[PDB]
């Protein structure tokens, strides 16, 4: 599964081209989409334009008819697979206006994590790095397995392990471990707090 | 490719049926490299000398035998019993007071191909599993 | 040239401002080989699997939280928080009596190039630094 | 052939004449690889950086100095005194109650060819030798 | 010191041939012998036939005159040296009757331990593996040195170390360490039991 | 900075020649000197002859006019730089009388430490090995930095780290860390001894 970002130009118009790769006939529930100035909050709900597929190379094309100041920003080609459950993060490229305009895209942005010389787009909360971003390729993101979690925009190759609430310490799961939140421990049915380690009970007696 | 491994405490760790401690192998900090895993045991692929280790987090609300054994054991077809390799005896604990004690050991042992290593804490009830960064078991060839 | 390092307790070790334990790198028993040091942290040059360790000498004249946490933590650009790797909870302690307790741990963790490792004792006050042969922090690739 | 060794507690371990702990080298779990042994000491053949370690099982029927020192020491022709490398201070203990406490430490130290390493427990009386899987001393080059 | 097992056939008869190798004139007290269906309990006392030598290749020959069902089983060529104290374990081969018969000899038998592709005969209790069994060669077994023991049919390359009973814990050797049994610890003259670790006293006071 | 030792002979006379190397015009306060039978106690104060320099190769010459028994012993070429603080230890050579006489210089002497095949002169207390002795070259010795010490004739490449007396254990520096002595810990102003680790207080209360 591959992701690319190219920007072709013809007279007044400027085309942005997200290119996606997937197994033929496993694209039902597949979405490619583009985002302007999304700090890793990029989704179909927050996209400029999207293409939900139905059934091996797929393409999304967003054309800017005129060069204007308000179209200046930071764009990102992203894809989401329903069957695989995999996200896909393309490189952060920028439009900048001055009169004139230029396209572009070691002090990596908040949404990126460094990999050798290059920077790479971070994966979503509850999403682990399956594959590092290539020079041309984008960041691939698997969802966390059950019993694990990641609670931030991350470049982690493995999900954090969910905390077990020890019954023998009179504890139970106040909040259950979601793939984006760790579990939290409160006191068992008919137990009270002895000491606290933070804003949570360390151990409980009945 | 030097054989290495680090396994972490899990929800199934305390079988408590006279079975050895079970471990996680893939999730979070857990990993295997040139070593197999079968029913609570590191399983040697490449025969030779391994530094083996284990930490266990102990604690509880007071005390129920104060003497508590934490050890590393060889299983082998070359002997019908388990073989003690590296073993510690602690005694950390009225029951009004909460307590914690870590128990770490490690050592270089020779392991033939197919020979197993397991961890046993003698009163599993005293093993306190939180996130698995508290209790672990692994090894690397030296 | 297998990456290795052993760092020793110093007069600046106890920042005690929620800062991680600082270490000596050149004097006496301290050394670095194929590993950098920045602000209390071992800094990985060559990515891969490292056996990491730390001993801390604890003690004092009696007791002021009895629960005391000694752990090894990953800093990385791949996550905004610190990541617990290897951690112990002790509880060794009227205040009329003097006491000492050593806290050792070690383990094999994977570290990507540029990723940091630090030591944290949760109540720095309880850390006792004599000549630095009592408290240390180091690692070697496996 | 990476230098490695693991030595085990013996009936002659407790000289108790201000002599360092002696160890078994051939029987059961004990072994030497590219390392000599002389009068309680690992003896380096190939100079370089060694991870060294020692566990000692402690215990008894009650308490007779509660402060107890377990350490690893360099002997060398380069200095007339012994050199402390890695050292712990414990204090585990009326005398009506029986108790056990394990004391483990390890660390990477540089050793020149012919330099020795020994183990010392400061009150040998508290060393409890059972089958030698309780107390040991070894090392491997890193 | 070598051991081999060969089975030559002539008409109705079938010869089983244990072949033994030893230093000339150090064979006084030397015994080669054969065992039918001995689960590593094989000894001269439990042999079918033996040859006690008196003074470099030695041989034992057991001839089966007729092919019968009751002669079907599992046979083992084994040698014992007096001067050396060394035992010798040949490979487990089988006779099987059906009408007809066949000789024979990864899921190694209880009496064997695996070594690479091959299986090897285990050594006797109180006997350590001096040499691994070759394809043609058999298992060589040294007796345990003093202060050590092995309490089972084993393929161990080193004997278990005997347990010391700590005087300072008010303990003494209830049973002494034989080369086939570990020592056991009871309370000293005029001492009693404080706690027990199993069915033995951990520590004693007077 | 180099050191050499040569012994030229002419008729009845015998010349001993310490040769020293130093940066031109940084020799003010520089001393080369010779010692007969000094067990690493060799200094200008205990020299036979010396040459204090004033301002690149320097030389000291001690001539023995007649071959006698009492001139038999063990000699050492040594230098000391004031500006650098650096000491310099030449090889231990020997004169031996019998009638006749011979000059000379794996079981290294008390004052030496082994380095490969060769032996090397040890550095003074409070002096670290900066450079190992060559076959022709001598031992170079830097003084310990502050916060460190060496309390013996040594061949150590790094100084021992001074012990800190923990205020929080009610301790203070009874003796301060000199470059030839470790610091020692006694009880703080108005504190007393709780326990002792040796002939020093481990911990103090008020
Ligand atoms: C966290 O997740 C666990 C499940 O992994 C939750 O425990 C489960 O809660 C459900 C809903 O209350 C229980 O359903 C029950 O089924 C019985 C029939 O046996 C019925 O009579 C009850 O009315 C109830 O609907 C379910 O038994 C239970 N699962 C197990 C295995 O015990 C837990 O509540 C969650 N924690 C929080 C705080 O949300
Ligand atoms: C386990 O083996 C040890 C020997 O390694 C046994 O201790 C020994 O026991 C013998 C027989 O009782 C002692 O013989 C004695 O000799 C003295 C003369 O000095 C004589 O007066 C006594 O009548 C007795 O025959 C022998 O002294 C002793 N060995 C040593 C070195 O003290 C031990 O008894 C065995 N344990 C068990 C429970 O079998
Ligand atoms: C070990 O060395 C330290 C210095 O590193 C010694 O502490 C110092 O002692 C001197 C001499 O007594 C103190 O001088 C004082 O200056 C004040 C003015 O502020 C004056 O009023 C006093 O009369 C006194 O002369 C100096 O303050 C102090 N240094 C520091 C930084 O506090 C220490 O005494 C030595 N220990 C031993 C046992 O020799
Ligand atoms: C991303 O993936 C696509 C599809 O896998 C790549 O196109 C293939 O490239 C390989 C290797 O160059 C060729 O062998 C195949 O013929 C291509 N497959 C098809 C069906 O066309 C594409 O080159 C990749 N893009 C980038 C920029 O890496
Ligand atoms: C077992 O041992 C015997 C005796 O050592 C072997 O016979 C010897 O074999 C070697 C090497 O092939 C020859 O150099 C000698 O000439 C033989 N010695 C004598 C005195 O005959 C025999 O080959 C071995 N058998 C097996 C099956 O390994
Ligand atoms: C010790 O030091 C002196 C001075 O550095 C050496 O003389 C120099 O040797 C180098 C290398 O052989 C030459 O390039 C220089 O020309 C010499 N310098 C001067 C200014 O003469 C001397 O050889 C050394 N002695 C020993 C025995 O090692």
Author numbering:
A (entry chain E), E (entry chain F), F (entry chain D): 27 to 81, 91 to 133, 136 to 142, 1040 to 1140
B (entry chain C), C (entry chain B), D (entry chain A): 92 to 155, 159 to 187, 192 to 240
Pull verbatim passages from the article behind this deposition:
HVEM is a TNF (tumor necrosis factor) receptor contributing to a broad range of immune functions involving diverse cell types. It interacts with a TNF ligand, LIGHT, and immunoglobulin (Ig) superfamily members BTLA and CD160. HVEM engages in bidirectional signaling, serving not only as a receptor but also as a ligand for IgSF receptor signaling. To dissect the molecular basis for multiple functions, we determined crystal structures that reveal the distinct HVEM surfaces that engage LIGHT or BTLA/CD160, including the human HVEM–LIGHT–CD160 ternary complex, with HVEM interacting simultaneously with both binding partners.
The asymmetric unit contains three copies of each hHVEM, hLIGHT, and hCD160, forming a ternary complex with 3:3:3 stoichiometry. Within the ternary assembly, hHVEM and hLIGHT exhibit the classical 3:3 TNF–TNFR assembly, with contacts that are very similar to the structure of the hHVEM–hLIGHT binary complex described above. The hHVEM–hLIGHT complex forms the core of the ternary complex, with each hHVEM CRD1 further binding a single molecule of hCD160 in a manner similar to that observed in the structure of the hHVEM–hCD160 binary complex. Notably, the structures of hHVEM–hLIGHT–hCD160 and hHVEM–hCD160 complexes relied on the use of a single chain hCD160–hHVEM fusion protein, as the relatively weak interaction of hCD160–hHVEM (7.1 ± 0.9 µM) does not support the stable complex formation in solution. The crystal structure of the hHVEM–hLIGHT–hCD160 complex provides direct evidence that hLIGHT and hCD160 can simultaneously engage hHVEM, resulting in a higher-order assembly with the potential of coordinated signaling through both hHVEM and hCD160. Notably, the simultaneous interaction of hCD160 and hLIGHT with hHVEM alters the local organization of hCD160, as engagement of hHVEM with trimeric hLIGHT may enforce close proximity of up to three hCD160 molecules with distinct geometric organization, as compared with the engagement of hCD160 and hHVEM in the absence of hLIGHT. Crystal structures of hHVEM in complex with hBTLA and hCD160 highlight an anti-parallel intermolecular β-strand interaction, in which the β-strand composed of residues G72-P77 from CRD1 in hHVEM contacts the edge β-strands in hBTLA and hCD160 through canonical main-chain-to-main-chain β-sheet hydrogen bonds. This pattern of hCD160 interactions with hHVEM is conserved in the ternary hHVEM–hLIGHT–hCD160 complex. The recognition interfaces in the ternary hHVEM–hLIGHT–hCD160 complex are similar to those in the binary hHVEM–hCD160 and hHVEM–hLIGHT complexes, suggesting that little molecular accommodation is required for HVEM to simultaneously engage two types of binding partners.
